[PDB]
RNA sequence: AAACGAUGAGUGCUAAGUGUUAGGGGGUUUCCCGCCCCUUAGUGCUGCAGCUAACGCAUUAAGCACUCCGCCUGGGGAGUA
RNA sequence: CGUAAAGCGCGCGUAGGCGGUUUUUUAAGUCUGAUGUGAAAGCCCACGGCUCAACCGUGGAGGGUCAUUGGAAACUGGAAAA
RNA sequence: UUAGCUAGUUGGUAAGGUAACGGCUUACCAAGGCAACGAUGCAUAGCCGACCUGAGAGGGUGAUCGGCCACACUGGAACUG
């Protein structure tokens, strides 16, 4: 949908450290279940444009991320990649 | 603004045209013509004016003239730096040049340098060709021109060390 | 995302003459602080004063004016910008306005006025004309 | 005769599917007659390896060596990065 | 498609006043909800500098610049073969 | 590139082009010096000789997006650190 | 309004062959290689020092002169050296 429940219960697991909120392991992990949920309902309705639209710009945002990580740091990409079965 | 007719002066016309004016019934023309006015020793000014015969249009024109007026910063026979002119998409530019060369330009133009006291400059004209924007031009790259010592009590540095 | 700050100072220094204010502000750095110092040097500006806070600059300069308000120049501009960088050499390194105006340049040595850069023989890359 | 240190190359592997066979990607970028900029254009060198020494997306620069298969002349000299995913 | 603002996208700077839509900070009131000032972002108009063939643009630039993309090099032929 | 021909209907985005601030470092670009080379004739300059000129000769300069190598590191680029 | 081309092709082994290295040629094994940074095709064309023009950047040409290449009624081949 989402909720800030589920949302802020997730991101402590993969939260780099407590304090921190950005590390976009966080985000490639809620942008991950964003586009879970929105293909759902996108599968639930057919025909529409706001939600394929958004699906996209989504994507486009978590690879360029993943892409940054990738320059960063090398292990978190793969540790992050074999986690949630995501970016084959 | 403030013509004076205590120096030497040269009259110059650059072009003439039969204008006209069209009511019903007959067709009403007046002609028109465009002059130049310097004492080329460092002095120049432009004119325009309009009347039914030549002499009177031009006359008009001329007196005109002396009522605007331009400093012309001159040196060593030849303006003391290069510039670019631009009017209305009458542009043109201008460029010093080795003394012995001459004023190389159009015929308006070169009437505009020649009357105004210069002797070897180069330029050419750009865009238009019709002779009222480019003399215009001309005039307005000779107001936004400056020499060695306009510039130099501007800045706190002097002259010599900085010359062309 | 700003391309190019060079570009931002010149236009702020433009558009400074446009309206005619003593005071303008601008985020520094250290070519930036060099070339506001060389355009004191040839006596385009009035003061210079860096200033600290989080976390560049802000770069106050203060400009300069004739007693009858005229502006000094009429003219500033850059020759190197991106995509299209230039260079140039110590004896092709060209004369603009000649001693009227002069050609700030980038040396190995450091940023220089054109003079100082054809005398020593050593050229580098042109950033802005100015005169 | 020794008077060429040969023309070391650096570039990166592209391919390894061929026997103790290469194809190096060098890499440099050149000027234009009519503007003044710069912009890169790639080669694929093919190159002589002894046992399939280099691996894929490797760094390793290059030597000229002789003729030695059709279209395929340099030689490798010493591989600079090896590494894995990244 | 006259898909238009006949105005490509992104970024920074340059006099003003007047409104409108969803907010914020402060003072004035026993209580601001009644009032004012200030800050945003869009959303308009009048206008200075400047710019333009002129009309007009003017912080919602067609001004002052930078990067990148698209495109034009006379009309008819012809969006035709 | 408003109206004159010229901004596609717009959107997501690959390759590419471009790049915030500071420090260290490399020296590829860049700058700089030398070396070899850019045949000669030709263009230009200077001189000399055909009575002059044309012409020819002589010598010089000039000519590389050239290669090697000695230095510089502001800027572009590479690396590392804020 | 030229988008896929290449099967001796690409790579290896072995041998032969060539003054020489080389799929240069053979037999075996492998499926690679080339291409938007423009392959292939088509069409035209010998190239260059230079010449003409232009202030300059550029544009056009390859007549004399010199350098290199290709050819000698058309196609194939080899001896001598």
Do not use: C
Not at chain 2, 26 to 43: C, E, I, Q, S, Y
Not at chain 2, 66 to 76: C, G, Q, S, T
Not at chain 3, 77 to 82: G, N
């Amino acid at each position: 949908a989402i909720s800030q429940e589920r949302k802020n219960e997730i991101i402590k697991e993969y939260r780099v450290h407590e304090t921190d909120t950005g590390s976009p392991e966080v985000q490639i992990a809620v942008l991950t279940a964003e586009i879970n949920a929105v293909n759902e309902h996108l599968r639930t309705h057919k025909k529409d444009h706001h939600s394929r639209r958004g699906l996209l710009k989504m994507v486009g945002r978590r690879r360029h991320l993943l892409n940054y990580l990738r320059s960063k740091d090398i292990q978190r990409y793969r540790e992050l990649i074999k986690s949630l079965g995501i970016r084959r | 603004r403030r013509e004076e007719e205590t120096k030497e002066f040269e009259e110059r016309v650059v072009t003439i045209n039969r204008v006209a004016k069209v009511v019903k019934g007959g067709r009403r023309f007046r002609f028109t013509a465009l002059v130049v006015v310097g004492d080329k020793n460092g002095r120049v000014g432009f004119g325009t004016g309009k009347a039914q015969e030549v002499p009177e249009a031009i006359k008009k024109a001329v007196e005109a003239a002396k009522k605007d007026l331009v400093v012309v910063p001159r040196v060593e026979g030849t303006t003391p730096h290069t510039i670019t002119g631009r009017y209305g998409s009458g542009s043109v530019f201008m460029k010093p040049a080795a003394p012995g060369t001459g004023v190389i330009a159009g015929g308006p133009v070169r009437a505009v340098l020649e009357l105004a006291g210069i002797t070897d400059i180069l330029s050419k004209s750009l865009g238009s060709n019709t002779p009222i924007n480019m003399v215009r031009a001309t005039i307005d790259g000779l107001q936004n021109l400056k020499n060695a010592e306009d510039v130099a009590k501007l800045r706190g540095k002097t002259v010599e060390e900085l010359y062309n | 995302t700003m391309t190019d700050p060079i570009a931002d100072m010149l236009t702020r220094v433009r558009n400074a003459n446009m309206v005619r204010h003593e005071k303008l502000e601008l985020p520094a750095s250290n070519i930036k602080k060099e070339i506001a110092e060389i355009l004191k040097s040839e006596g385009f500006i009035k003061n210079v004063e860096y200033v600290e806070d989080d976390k560049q600059g802000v770069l106050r300069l203060f400009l300069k004016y004739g007693q009858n308000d005229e502006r000094v120049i009429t003219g500033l501009k850059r020759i190197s910008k991106p995509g299209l960088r230039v260079y140039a050499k110590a004896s092709e390194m060209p004369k603009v306005l000649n001693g009227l105006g002069i050609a700030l340049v980038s040396t190995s040595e450091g940023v220089i006025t054109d003079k100082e850069a054809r005398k020593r023989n050593v050229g580098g890359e042109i950033i802005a004309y100015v005169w | 005769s020794e008077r060429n240190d040969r023309k070391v190359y650096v570039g990166k592997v592209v391919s390894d599917k061929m026997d103790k066979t290469i194809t190096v990607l060098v890499e440099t970028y050149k000027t234009h007659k009519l503007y003044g900029k710069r912009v890169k254009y790639s080669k694929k060198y093919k190159t002589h390896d002894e046992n399939n020494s280099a691996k894929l997306g490797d760094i390793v620069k290059i030597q000229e060596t002789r003729p030695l298969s059709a279209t395929k002349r340099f030689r490798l000299v010493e591989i600079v990065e090896e590494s894995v995913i990244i």
